[PDB]
Design a protein around this ligand. Structure first.
Ligand SMILES: Cc1nc(N2CCCC2)c2ccc(OCC3CC3)cc2n1
Ligand SMILES: [Mg+2]
Ligand SMILES: [Zn+2]
Length: 313
């Protein structure tokens, strides 16, 4: 009960900042996550024996893909940690517990292919889950791991508290389906602007947690430019593999997934920042003012991509 995780001084300080990068030492990432749970939630939130066994089974069920890997899991959980730490009093005990776990689990057993590619391939998961295919799978893998012997990190919750947290995790993980983000943010925009947004309305909280999940999932675009630029390589490595697999099914992929159209990446990033990222962190900053550093970092990166296009890099 008296066993705190501590970090070296540089990490202890920078882990509190939105733009923190967890580093290239995989063996420190479990301790980084436990450190964040303990400070976000408490040293009592979970039995350490069970949490450690949970973390290591989750790690094992992430695959060795360029981007949708164990590093992404921990990175997305860190962005959620920064949001929660900058909005201390807005979230319940159950929500702080649920959301760090949802983030760690949100891409379990990802193969590096989109929902689209699964549907065109006619993958069995596309027959089992007609929409949000991978996300329903990620939630399924999360429940599977929670049910392994010694892995039920929620055992100490009441029956109804257990149902509530599993329901937060399910909605949180389904919300990472970017196809759902557009309508979710549009509705949050209207509610915020007509003044009807009400954090005591469960349907509204659900929508705000949804947008936090998009914000954390896209957080590559809110890092310092060298981290953003090097992560873009990993992202495009999966996109180009998917485009290659489209060409194998005899389907010309969209240009974003065609490795013969790498020249178009900088302009593809502009569209993405303007159509997705900036609108996302803008609405997030309206609802949760202390998350403004994410919007500022995102605009800084938009400006860096504008500079790549102007051939200034
Ligand atoms: C061009 C670009 N870049 C992406 N990543 C860069 C950093 C975060 C995600 C994307 C991540 C998901 C994605 O799904 C497709 C969205 C456009 C309708 C598209 C993306 N398109
Ligand atoms: Mg995902
Ligand atoms: Zn993700």
């Amino acid at each position: 009960g008296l066993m705190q995780f501590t970090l070296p001084v540089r990490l202890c300080k920078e882990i509190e900042l939105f733009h923190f990068d967890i580093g290239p030492f995989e063996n420190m990432w479990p301790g980084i996550f436990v450190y964040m749970v303990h400070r976000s939630c408490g040293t009592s939130c979970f039995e350490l024996e069970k949490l450690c066994r949970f973390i290591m089974s989750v790690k094992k069920n992430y695959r060795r893909v360029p981007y949708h890997n164990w590093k992404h899991a921990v990175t997305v959980a860190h962005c959620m940690y920064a949001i929660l730490q900058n909005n201390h009093t807005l979230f319940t005990d159950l929500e702080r517990k649920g959301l760090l776990i949802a983030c760690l689990c949100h891409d379990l057993d990802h193969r590096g292919f989109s929902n689209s590619y699964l549907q065109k391939f006619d993958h069995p998961l596309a027959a089992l889950y007609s929409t949000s295919t991978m996300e329903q799978h990620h939630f399924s893998q999360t429940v599977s791991i929670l049910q392994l012997e010694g892995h039920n990190i929620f055992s100490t919750l009441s029956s109804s508290e257990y149902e509530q947290v599993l329901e937060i995790i399910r909605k949180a993980i389904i919300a990472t389906d970017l196809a759902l983000y557009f309508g979710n943010r549009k509705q949050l925009e209207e509610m915020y602007q007509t003044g009807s947004l009400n954090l005591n309305n469960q349907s509204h909280r659900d929508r705000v947690i949804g947008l936090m999940m998009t914000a954390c999932d896209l957080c590559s675009v809110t890092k310092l430019w060298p981290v953003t630029k090097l992560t873009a390589n990993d992202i495009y490595a999966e996109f180009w593999a998917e485009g290659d697999e489209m060409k194998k099914l005899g389907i010309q992929p969209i240009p974003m997934m065609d490795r013969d159209k790498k020249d178009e990446v900088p302009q593809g990033q502009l569209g993405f920042y303007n159509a997705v990222a900036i609108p996302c962190y803008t609405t997030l900053t309206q609802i949760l003012p202390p998350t403004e550093p994410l919007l500022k970092a995102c605009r800084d990166n938009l400006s860096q991509w504008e500079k790549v296009i102007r051939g200034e890099e």
